[PDB]
Amino acid sequence: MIEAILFDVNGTLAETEELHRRAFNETFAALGVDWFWDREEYRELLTTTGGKERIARFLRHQKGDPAPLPIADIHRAKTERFVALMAEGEIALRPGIADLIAEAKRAGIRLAVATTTSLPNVEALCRACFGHPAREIFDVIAAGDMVAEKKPSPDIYRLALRELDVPPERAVALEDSLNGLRAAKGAGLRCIVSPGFYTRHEEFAGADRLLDSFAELGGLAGLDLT
Template identity: 35%
Template sequence: MIKAVVFDFDGLILDSETSVYNAIQEIFTEHSCNMPLELWQQCIGTKDFLDPFEYLEEQINKKVDRKGLRAKHHERVLSMLEGEKPLPGVEDYLEAAKELGLKIALATSSSRQWVTGHLEKLNLLSYFDCLKTADDVEHVKPDPALYLEAVKCLGVKPNEAIAFEDSANGARAAKAAGLYCVVIPNEVTKGLVFGDVDHQMESLAEVQLKELMNRF
């Protein structure tokens, strides 16, 4: 019996993944270079897989102001996200989960500060019974720790929860932790191979939560 739902954040609730990649691509273009999407996709949902500015230096064969470029990238991403709304179906799923009496958690490889700030702006923070972020674990996705901590926090067993993910790293983490996993790719992650997930759809608006739960 499903008792809980656990959401990823970036690219699943808010399409920050597209903004993050586009902002990186802008910086690379300014240096007459390119960040291949295929390489960037391997970074999504995890942390410290690739330093884009180290990669930039390797491609152009000279040093760059990494600190300055990181700050520029961060500001550009925030600018791109200004006024962005939750992805289709997100609010409906959160509301439906509450009405169905499900417990709700968030499991993300991002920092708590990043997540809570955006959830507050989106007026979604109050929906969550538990937040597990990179600040709470030693290893982020694809390690299962975030999902194991999330279900522990909610007081449910892994097989009593459905994880919603947009990345291959996130999906691997959810399945390794023993949760059901539903994948909703975004503009940056579509085309990835997600492996042994339980269901995949184009958006959360495609199927109502109650109908989806009946499949499990």
Template identity: 35%
Template sequence: MTGALIFDFDGTLVDTEAAVLVAWQETFRERGGELPLDVWHTVIGTQHTAAAMFELLAKDDEHLDKVAIRTGVRARVTELLASEGPRPGVKEYLEDAHEQGLRLAIASSSTGDWVATHLNRLGLADAFEAVLTGDLHEAKPSPDLYLAALAALDLPPSEAIAFEDSPHGVTAAKAAGLKCVAVPNPITAVLNFDHADLVLDSLADEPLSALLSR
């Protein structure tokens, strides 16, 4: 029996991925270059994004002001996300989960302050019983975040379902023993999700009750 739903945050609950990508693309273009999407795809769902971007930028500029770049990227991302709401179907899933007595958690490779800022902005902070983040646990594709979420909920993996938007996230969830539903966002939709138990274009495509009946 399913007792809990554990969601990735970036790109799954909210399409932050697009804003982060745009901010880094603009950073590269300001310096006369282009961000290779094949490199971007390798870091989605991990904590390696900034390091990978700086490594690429350093090929043309050995004296990068990383602090200034980080500050500028984050400010641009915040600007882009100011009016961005949850992805389609998310609110309905959360409401239906509460009605059915399912517990909710987040397992995100991002930092706690990032996740908390956007949960508060969206009015979703109280929806989740546990929020596990990458500043306290090893990031995906390690299973640590999902194992920590299960421990916080005091549930075995057989009683929870994970929701992810990236192959790295699916790998982490499966390594922790969970069933995993992949809900790719526009950026990750071109990637391989064969290891997911189910792939949906959007949570709006299938009500939670129908998904659970599977």
């Protein structure tokens, strides 16, 4: 029925994108460039997953300061800032997530992360939100540049499934975004979508369930869809 649950990270485990946006903007300020992404701009840029990819897209169009460093270096600084901001301890898990995970663990169900985000962010979020290193919560962590093409490419889900050794028909993905749903479906997975601030405007055609809150699953029971 379900032998594994695969979780997206940003927008799914926790509402994190405003902290990402802060970490980007503060990094840009610290580099002495005039770049600044407000919510309207960030909503658009969020359709490109991966922070390096997002910076690259922004730089193709923007008419402010030229990049002073390679994008990888800008993004590495932004990651360090995000890890630091996460440690402060303001971020909570989305409703239903903590209970679902604890319930899955009691039931012996294997858990993965499949995310476009940088690996240190996963670690930082798990310390802050669960109080544990990521590998104590998730049996498999597929993140960041572990694949060459990010969501909507299914590669990150295919990596996670290969490491889980669970066929997709015995697993399910939880996502918040359209590119996430596309990726999970591309790996042959049932996908439960609950959007947030930045993704509620999207069309979720093909989602197995579209929910206002992951608490609406009622835990493990709600996962085993047709």
